[PDB]
Design a protein around this ligand. Structure first.
Ligand SMILES: NC(=S)c1cccs1
Ligand SMILES: [Cl-]
Ligand SMILES: [Cl-]
Ligand SMILES: [Cl-]
Ligand SMILES: [Cl-]
Ligand SMILES: [Cl-]
Ligand SMILES: [Cl-]
Ligand SMILES: [Mg+2]
Length: 346
């Protein structure tokens, strides 16, 4: 049966939500227009997001469908999942607003990055790689792993956030900005068609920062950041240069004086030698040669947490819709079907 809804004025608009959600209070806009609430059916504090103008254009309608498909698929301890999705509409004809419910995040990794022991670094990076093995097993690329997208609780337990939101703009990536400091060079500079290996570069940047307390590559712009990267890992050899499909980018790279890879034990002074070894296998310029998430879970650095019988993979994820061309009302009807078919977790 359909639940009873009630109305309240929040975040410049009228929110209409099922009675089970009580004590709504606005909560930053990085993940949308969000309120905290108490869910009386489950006893959890939750985040309720009301989508802004979900079906105003073809691009917005497809983005709404993409976010709902991604959140409905993710079922893993180290990844954000969907607790509920609802609309006050009683038919497709009156369908206009979409609301998403997730666990309420308290702190992200920025706040922690506290005096972190090496045991803390082992456990946090282990959980990121466990979640990433699951994400990559469904042929999803995260593209934006960074400390503000990692939720952490009091017991050091971690979840990965940021799925199905708007692609980052050119201006968001300009200058001295954390949204670019964790990006792999081949996607920062559009060297080539990228793949899931970009996410392992991001994990290496995060792990270095937990070990030192400092941003690894805090570039003041794209070019300054590339110079910091190449000083640490060395300039590319002929094998990688061949793979840079952009003739323009390949030509700029060759204008730079050649530099050897640095000694990571002298960069990360005093760190666990096993941590140094793992960083050298993540922060490889040629993405073909980076360690994978599944391979990294078996690295000796994680020996006290690794359990190959408790590192699950995902059900298959059909993303054929991504190459499909549809009208606004066809994306809207697809979204409506996914709202009404949702089944809550056990
Ligand atoms: N798309 C993401 S990650 C979220 C929606 C509502 C809360 S988080
Ligand atoms: Cl209810
Ligand atoms: Cl969750
Ligand atoms: Cl509606
Ligand atoms: Cl960040
Ligand atoms: Cl798949
Ligand atoms: Cl699917
Ligand atoms: Mg993002």
């Amino acid at each position: 049966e359909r639940p009873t809804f009630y109305r309240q004025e929040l975040n410049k608009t009228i929110w209409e939500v099922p009675e089970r959600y009580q004590n709504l209070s606005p909560v930053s806009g990085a993940y949308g227009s969000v309120c905290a609430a108490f869910d009386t059916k489950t006893g959890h504090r939750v985040a309720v997001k009301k989508l802004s103008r979900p079906f105003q254009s073809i691009i917005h309608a497809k983005r709404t469908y993409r976010e709902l498909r991604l959140l409905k698929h993710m079922k893993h301890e180290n990844v954000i999942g969907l607790l509920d999705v609802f609309t006050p509409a009683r038919s497709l004809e009156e369908f206009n607003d979409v609301y998403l419910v997730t666990h309420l995040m308290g702190a992200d990794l920025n706040n922690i990055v506290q005096k972190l022991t090496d045991d803390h670094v082992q456990f946090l990076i282990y959980q990121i790689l466990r979640g990433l093995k699951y994400i990559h097993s469904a042929d999803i690329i995260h593209r934006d792993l960074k400390p503000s997208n990692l939720a952490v609780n009091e017991d050091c337990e971690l979840k990965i956030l940021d799925f199905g939101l708007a692609r980052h703009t050119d201006d968001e990536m300009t200058g001295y900005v954390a949204t670019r400091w964790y990006r792999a060079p081949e996607i920062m500079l559009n060297w080539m068609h990228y793949n899931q290996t970009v996410d392992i570069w991001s994990v290496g940047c995060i792990m270095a920062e937990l070990l030192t307390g400092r941003t690894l590559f805090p570039g003041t712009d794209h070019i300054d950041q590339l110079k910091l990267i190449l000083r640490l890992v060395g300039t590319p050899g002929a094998e990688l240069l061949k793979k840079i499909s952009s003739e323009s980018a390949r030509n700029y790279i060759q204008s730079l004086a050649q530099m050897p890879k640095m000694n990571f034990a002298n960069v990360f002074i005093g760190a666990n030698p096993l941590a140094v070894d793992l960083l050298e296998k993540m922060l490889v310029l040629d993405s073909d040669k980076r360690i994978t998430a599944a391979q990294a879970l078996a690295h000796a650095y994680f020996a006290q947490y690794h359990d190959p019988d408790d590192e699950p993979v995902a059900d298959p994820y059909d993303q054929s819709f991504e190459s499909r061309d549809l009208l606004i009302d066809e994306w809207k009807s697809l979204t409506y079907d996914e709202v009404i078919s949702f089944v809550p977790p056990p």
